[PDB]
Amino acid sequence: MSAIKPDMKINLRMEGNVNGHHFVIDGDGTGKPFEGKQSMDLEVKEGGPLPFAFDILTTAFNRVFAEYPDHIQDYFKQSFPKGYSWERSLTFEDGGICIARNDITMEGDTFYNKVRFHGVNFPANGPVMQKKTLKWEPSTEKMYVRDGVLTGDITMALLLEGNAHYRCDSRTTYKAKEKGVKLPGYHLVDHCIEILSHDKDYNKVKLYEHAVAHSGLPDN
Amino acid sequence: MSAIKPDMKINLRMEGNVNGHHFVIDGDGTGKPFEGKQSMDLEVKEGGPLPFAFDILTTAFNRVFAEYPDHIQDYFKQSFPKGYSWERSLTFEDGGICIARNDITMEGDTFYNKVRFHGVNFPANGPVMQKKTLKWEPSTEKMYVRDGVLTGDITMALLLEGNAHYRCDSRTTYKAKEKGVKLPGYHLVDHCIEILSHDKDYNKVKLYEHAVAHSGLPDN
């Protein structure tokens, strides 16, 4: 089928609202799907500077960029050239809850992402509205089928100032646009996301991700 | 002294997206604030007929309509003519999660509502996407202060066909537009919402609510 090439470009646009603050962010970058790496340049067009921690938006900024071994079905590379979409909920330990959504399409060598983001109930004295986050810690996503839908469960932790951690529970559902794409079996996906550079107000940010899929012990 | 009249008008516009489906609803009704009763005529302008259960929207369709006794601070009537807003998350037991927000203003004898609704991860064979809901059961909302913000917790239940119940946990935060409104103490608010009439596609709906505030046992 080909469709996916070793070097592909990414184009992204996000419109969102968190605790009543509207914002718009643009994204531009490239990535290596078969090696599971990608980078993007992010710029805030509306709502800058953001009154909350930028780290709660980073994982909404494509599982096509993941190294898949031969013994595990790649549900996301086979959903193309037509594409797919996903829906995610983010439940934080202090009551903050977010909801994300992304429609992914491809034409030529460029991926086009249309993202929506919405969060509510972050406390004013909490680390999110006070911008006390440092980074996401490494995480392992669980892939399994539920009600004929590929579902991803993952419990992440933000690192805070003072060597504290901030719990978040995530659940994502993936739906291919065309009928007939084979669903995979149970497997794990390792994740690593990191901000490389940013200005003082995070109007411009450079993001990076590395992701690899595996079967777990003892097959690592 | 009010501000609020014994008979007020209600004007409401809602935009939303549930499981990827976009929709637009308009509302027009009246209500008696000091008796805690209101009614509204709803009409689906875009996205009709709705492919999901209409019931999951009715609690997003104002605590000004609630009977408050004298010994309990009435945070919501003290918020006008300036107004207030609220944010809410709905966590259904089978993984469906909704977030909601509404900005309430006042002009003359009319309340103006701007509502946003977003939900994700509803199972395709669940009671919501299968339209197996009948009504909301009577419920009691808890009102207390959390991080300097008035908060309402309530564990509701939807009656399904066959007399089964579908649980949902709700969490709402209320923010007055002007600083200086005295926050209340712990109390409770009884709720009762009911659809009076509808077409068979739920494109036109007539909604009704009755709510009463009290202190709980052993007297009120």
Added chain:
Amino acid sequence: HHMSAIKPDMKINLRMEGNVNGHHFVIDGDGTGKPFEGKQSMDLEVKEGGPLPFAFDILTTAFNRVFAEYPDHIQDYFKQSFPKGYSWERSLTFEDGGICIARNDITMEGDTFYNKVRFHGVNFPANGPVMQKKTLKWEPSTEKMYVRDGVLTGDITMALLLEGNAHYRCDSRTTYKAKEKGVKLPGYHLVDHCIEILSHDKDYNKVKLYEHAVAHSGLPDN
């Protein structure tokens, strides 16, 4: 269906063995109550593990829905479960990760109810309100009774008043099972609750507890 054999004045006899954060304890109870009026009181005494290193309030809910005023139009599943009795299982999930499970087997002989309660909790933080003894009281609450998987279930989201006008959340769920065949299952209804500690010494080795509970159908009926 049949007769309750419940008198207007009943006695209560209770024994609880438990373990919270690794601390073992045994507490005995003795009291009286009026079932048809939904009121009951008990004198508690710690026999082992005193003085308790945790807040006493987390136990008071474990210390019988027979003591609840039921109207005529709602099925009274608990007074119909006698003279044979019933039992319940409960889980208490607190907002800072503390989780408790409880269990009680209730029988009746003569005019006295007998209770055998077990209580276990783990993962309460060392600096949390429970291990620091910063609780004040439970706030009034309303319990949801409904049938779930053929078993009568009770749902409550309670709140503990803390020092400084803070509140401590707790999510509770109880399943009720009658020991006799043929007890009718009720429909959806609510039960208002009120519990408070009347008196106590300063180490909570001796406590006097009180409760009032009334069932209704919610708005706009009752």
Added chain:
Amino acid sequence: HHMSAIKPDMKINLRMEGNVNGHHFVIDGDGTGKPFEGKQSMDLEVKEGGPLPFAFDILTTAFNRVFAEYPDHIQDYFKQSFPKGYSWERSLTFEDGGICIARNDITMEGDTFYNKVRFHGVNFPANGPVMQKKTLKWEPSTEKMYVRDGVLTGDITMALLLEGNAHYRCDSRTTYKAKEKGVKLPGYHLVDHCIEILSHDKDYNKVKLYEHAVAHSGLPDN
């Protein structure tokens, strides 16, 4: 200091008493393991309460993080807590309302670990996969180790494979506490797990269990 308290080949002795949905049981365990390789095997025998009316798989993770392969750049909190030992508390939250708590007090003598385990569960529905015995195994999982309130905490989110390629969801959290003060707490890290039943009779009165655990720092390359 001289020799380490941990040997390359160590034996395991275990005793568990518990109660699930009102059913009491007692199980004994005997096994061996290689702590530095992160592997252990055990032979289990039900002494009381056989046969168990629930799925055996819900007990297997209660049957010692000493058996884990720890690299040099990650602090090994569990091997440093001996010869005195440590304890842990755990809560298991299943997606259909079943809730479990567990304890274990671990000591050491010679080449043998001693385990004293308690287990309690409530509110498993009669039509659920645990009471119907429709579970097959635990899937491979990854445990998150981090500090919370000065206590090492392990957050793990597991999944049981069911008959018919369905999965049963479970949330678990463990707190670890060493009996000696002064053990250096580790930073954030991950622990890969693999648990599996090797053999069993028809009623699961005799079970052979095996686990493999490895600690690492997560991506990249770790």
